[PDB]
Amino acid sequence: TARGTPSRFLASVLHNGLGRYVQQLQRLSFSVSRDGASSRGAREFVEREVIDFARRNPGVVIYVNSRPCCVPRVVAEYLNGAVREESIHCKSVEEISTLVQKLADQSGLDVIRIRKPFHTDNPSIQGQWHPFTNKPTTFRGLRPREVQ
Amino acid sequence: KFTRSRIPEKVFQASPEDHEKYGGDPQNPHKLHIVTRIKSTRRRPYWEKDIIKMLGLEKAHTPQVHKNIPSVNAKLKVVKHLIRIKPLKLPQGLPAEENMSNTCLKSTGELVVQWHLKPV
Amino acid sequence: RQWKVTSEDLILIGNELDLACGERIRLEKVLLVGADNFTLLGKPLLGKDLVRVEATVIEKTESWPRIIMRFRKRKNFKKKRIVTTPQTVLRINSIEIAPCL
Amino acid sequence: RGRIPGRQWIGKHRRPRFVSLRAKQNMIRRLEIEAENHYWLSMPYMTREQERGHAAVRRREAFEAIKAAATSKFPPHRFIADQLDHLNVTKKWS
Amino acid sequence: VLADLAIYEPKTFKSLAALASRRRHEGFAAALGDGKEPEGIFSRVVQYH
Amino acid sequence: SKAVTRHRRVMHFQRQKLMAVTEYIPPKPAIHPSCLP
Amino acid sequence: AGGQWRLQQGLAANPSGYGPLTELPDWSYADGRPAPPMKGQLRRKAERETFARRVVLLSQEMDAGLQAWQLRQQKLQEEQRKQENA
Amino acid sequence: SSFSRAPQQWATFARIWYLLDGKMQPPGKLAAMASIRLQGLHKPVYHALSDCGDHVVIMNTRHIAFSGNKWEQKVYSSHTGYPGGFRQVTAAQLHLRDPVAIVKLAIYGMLPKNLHRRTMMERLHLFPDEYIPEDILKNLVEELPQPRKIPKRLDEYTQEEIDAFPRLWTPPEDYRL
Amino acid sequence: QEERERNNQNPWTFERIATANMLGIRKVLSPYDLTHKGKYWGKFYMPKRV
Amino acid sequence: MTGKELFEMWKIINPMGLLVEELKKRNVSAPESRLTRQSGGTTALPLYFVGLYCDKKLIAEGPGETVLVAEEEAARVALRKLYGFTENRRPWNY
RNA sequence: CCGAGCCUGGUGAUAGCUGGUUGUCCAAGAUAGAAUCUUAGUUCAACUUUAAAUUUGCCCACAGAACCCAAAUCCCCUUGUAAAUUUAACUGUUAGUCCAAAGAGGAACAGCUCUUUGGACACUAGGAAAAAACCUUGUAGAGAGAGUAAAAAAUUUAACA
Ligand SMILES: [Mg+2]
Ligand SMILES: [Mg+2]
Ligand SMILES: [Mg+2]
Ligand SMILES: [Mg+2]
Ligand SMILES: [Mg+2]
Ligand SMILES: [Mg+2]
Ligand SMILES: [Mg+2]
Ligand SMILES: [Mg+2]
Ligand SMILES: [Mg+2]
Ligand SMILES: [Mg+2]
Ligand SMILES: [Mg+2]
Ligand SMILES: [Zn+2]
């Protein structure tokens, strides 16, 4: 809910778009279990897909602990220090791939209400409106009902 | 009480002034009606709404094509007030198999076989 | 939907574009373009050769969970659902005009 | 003061509604487009006898298609692959 | 965007209002004489195909 | 209620709009037929 | 606004209906490559194709029925000729 | 622009002192323009939360004029609160007792019925005569025009206008006048 | 009365629109209207109506 | 840097004096300050517009709470447009 | 706390009557009447629901359907459409309000009562002032896009030789 949840103005981190773009997903950390039917999708994912994912995205680093876990987790640390945790418990390989990809595409900052869908540092050209823009002046600058 | 409303045939006898006004030549008459639903089939009898649905006008402001023959004329005479009619007009002849995709309608009842999407 | 944009400004799109992050894109449709002392209006839109609006894709992000509840009183009619639509964030890199006019 | 008896729009006495040029214009529009419909419904193309038996083949074949669609009803097939895919829940690394 | 230009770009909005007024005057000339005259310069339209 | 009543039976709004549309518009010339002719 | 004017001119009442403002692509690669079509334009093209196919089918059925009627009537004439010949 | 943040914000959301002469004008139209200019609708930066209102001054509220028999037909009615405290007074007596009340009530009705109505009415200013205190005829900006133009009297119609206007008919000489 | 109903400038008449049912007004109306077009409403009589 | 304007990054004093020195170096007359418009001079929220005119030629005008703030802001505007750091300038290309 | 005591037990008495009836999401879905010590209920029918078999189902075009003393209806190949009948198994609704129209009763009273044809409501939305029943409008989401629908009452009045 909007009045319950906080908000923010739309913005990009460190002005990522202007210069060279950077994949702002710093680090991933998978926690999967050898056994456990919940971790079968994650195990197949680390078997086959994760290699291609690393080959595609060098900027990101991946850690895999591979320890006993009743629920397999995936952690994502961003440049800002933002931590984003997800539970991949009983998840399909394609859904894991989509999750990891949308994490890579996601920026390192909270998902909350955005007040407006845009942001312009220089919003005004020609000068923004003030009351005296569209009205003329007076000879010698004389107020109404003024003799001298 | 309220029942079906039989229409006299004398209503459907166009006059010369009507001809020269609407631009419809009785000789060499058109073949196809573009029909569009305007009013809600709600607050209307069940026969009216099911006639609409069988003609295929459950969707509003979506022109649908029918023939010009008495058997259909009967239905859309029953449901005149819920629809607007126009004839189909095409200068470019029937769409050839190669121009099946580059077709486009117009508000003027025209159907252009080719759509360059670019001004003169 | 329309926008007015400049250089080095962000824009949000409430749908997916199928463009990986960091890729560039040329926007064709422009209703007008204006400088400090003049403007260029279209009929309706401007020529392709005259303008060149380039943008970059920066982010694909899932929206905050938007709640949808339907309730009717004294009928036991209650149903909730949550939606998350995708967004694509763009940044307009450059705006330039050609001498043709 | 100024009330009217009972419900506002029903009964022997009710609130008097009045017409506006707005609504008059709207309904004249509806009925003139209806007159255009009358004109275009006039001057048909073919007669009863010309339009009698031309689409019978299409109606028949469409109805036989519907009949076939209704008759073609069975349970779907069952597969050993779909049966044994369930064993893959206890997959584990060596 | 009309409001956005009215706020942040008043000169462009003045240009648009002037254009609109000129189109009004062309339409009034047309109401006086519908045809039998050269069509307006801005009232002219672009046809697509 | 009944159709025939002592009072003027208030009619349906569509009917009143119809009756408001249909009236005798007398054909008048542009010029009054006394001052000029 | 202006729907009646657009219709008098022949254009769509709602500018979003058809025309270059909606039918054209909204974006393309900076390399100059053509972008993939949007789903809206694809479904519009598909329904327009079905529309034209239907128009063709209806017209062909009408023409075939008229020709069949004409053939039946000229056969009627020929068979009366046969009758009075017999 | 090239203006600093705070100064530009100040110049944008600044208030303006409009002036009006109600010499033989309708309080209805006067109140309509005053109400829009007190809301701040005329400002393209208007929003109900942001109090973008403006100060307005009226003069010659005593010398206002209605259209029709309003002076006697119109009734301003108010209940003191006690039994029998229902009072009705025509615009005539109401004006004779206070020439400002008519215009201020018209504007009070014109304005929205929110809690900002009272603040905007406080920002409003009224004067029966063409007399203003020093500060609030000094700190002005401009005088917007009147809603209606007043017609001229025979005392005002110059001779050349009368001569340009043609005579329409020829009286018989044998008549008294 | 007959020259008035002949010279009325209004293109639209009760009898026309009711015989045609141009707006589904046969709902609100009676079958008797089809003879008592406008002049009558219950027992009353409107001669000015046409 | 694109976000922050220049006077947010570069503090200064007596901007009118710096302006006078710059204009003297550029060999033009010493400009005079004149309030162009004003509102609420008596009330608690005064507003003034001060323009700087050289040889009957305006370079810049600025709003302000008081006349001093308005004239110093106008000097700031003139400095902006002289040094070419107007917000409406050509953005940094790439 | 005696129209006939209190306690225990049968007794978890019975109650066509009132109240209540526990996680999420989707879909289809208010509907003629007969009998009944029966009208606050139930049984059958009708409507509705699920899964299956089959093919005709709906609108309908000429012709066709009474002497006595009107709007429409029935049947109906075409046509436009895709539903319909049957088989297996239950349930629930079976205490109904307003508007228009044809009528009966009453006072040519009722927001009255009773039948018939239709619409709406009992499902969201805009308007008419708030409003169930009136006018537009339906199939469901996000938009800081757009075109439209129904949608604001007008009236001032009497001279006379
Ligand atoms: Mg009441
Ligand atoms: Mg009745
Ligand atoms: Mg006892
Ligand atoms: Mg449902
Ligand atoms: Mg019996
Ligand atoms: Mg019972
Ligand atoms: Mg049949
Ligand atoms: Mg009743
Ligand atoms: Mg009742
Ligand atoms: Mg019920
Ligand atoms: Mg919809
Ligand atoms: Zn005259």
Q: Where are the alpha helices (DSSP H) in chain B?
A: 16-22, 46-55, 70-78
Count of domains observed in chain A:
1
Q: Where are the alpha helices (DSSP H) in F1-37?
A: 13-21
Asked whether C5 and C27 are in contact (CB, 8 A), the reply is: no
What is chain A written as a DSSP string?
-TTTS-EE----GGGTTTSS----EEEEEEE--SS-GGGHHHHHIIIIIHHHHHHH-SSSEEEE-----SS-EEEEEETT--EEEEE-TT--HHHHHHHHHHHHHS-SS---EES-SEEESS--SS----TTTTS---TT---SS---
Token representation of residue A91: 């998840």
- Can you list the pairs that H92-98 forms with residues at least 24 positions away whose Cβ atoms lie under 8 Å? H95/H62, H95/H71
H/E run at residue H92: helix H91-97
With an 8 Å Cβ cutoff, are D46 and G66 in contact? yes
- Provide the CA I28 to C1' K134 distance, Å, integer: 12
What is G42-76 written as a DSSP string?
HHHHHHHHHHHHHHHHHHHHHHHHHHHHHHHHHHH
Residues β-bridged to residue C90 = C11, C57
Cα-Cα end-to-end distance for chain B? 60
**For residue J46, what are the CA distances in angstroms to A32, H7, H14, J37, J63?**
68, 12, 9, 11, 10
Token representation of residue A98: 């989509």
- Chain D CB contacts of B85 below 8 Å: 36-37, 40-41
Q: Which nucleotides of K are covered by protein (CB under 7 A)?
A: 24-26, 52-61, 70-73, 77-84, 98-106, 108-112, 116-120, 122-124, 128-131, 133-139, 141-153
H/E run at residue A96: helix A93-105
Nearest CA in chain H to A124: H1
Chains in contact with D via at least 3 Cβ–Cβ pairs below 8 Å: A, B, F, G, I
Token representation of residue G20: 């270059």
**Closest by Cα among J63, A148, A134, A136 to H138:** A148
Q: How many CB pairs under 8 A join D and I?
A: 13
Domain ranges of chain B: 1-117
Q: How far apart are CA C49 and CA C54, in angstroms?
A: 13
Domain that holds residue A72: 1-148
Q: Where are the alpha helices (DSSP H) in chain D?
A: 21-41, 56-71, 80-84
Name the structure determination technique.
cryo-EM
With an 8 Å Cβ cutoff, are H138 and A124 in contact? no
Resolution in A: 3.7
Token representation of residue A125: 């050209």
Domain ranges of chain G: 2-86
- State whether the Cα torsion J62-J67-J72-J78 is positive or negative: positive
Token representation of residue F17: 């709009």
How many H-runs (helices) and E-runs (strands) does chain F carry?
Answer: 1, 0
Token representation of residue H74: 């119109």
Q: How far apart are CA H56 and CA H34, in angstroms?
A: 7
* Burial of A32 (C-beta count, 10 Å sphere; 0-12/13-18/19+): buried
| Count of CB atoms situated within 10 Å of the CB of F6 | 7
Count of domains observed in chain H:
1
Q: How far apart are CA J34 and CA C26, in angstroms?
A: 48
| Pairing of β H125-126 and β H55-59 | parallel
H/E run at residue J57: strand J57-64
Sheet of A25-31: strands edge to edge?
Answer: A61-64, A25-31, A73-78, A83-87
- Chain B CB contacts of D37 below 8 Å: 80, 83-85
Nearest CA in chain H to A136: H142
Domain that holds residue H78: 1-177
With an 8 Å Cβ cutoff, are A134 and E6 in contact? no
- Provide the CA C22 to C1' K12 distance, Å, integer: 75
- The CATH number of the domain holding residue A38 is 3.40.30.10
Integer-rounded Cα radius of gyration of chain C: 20
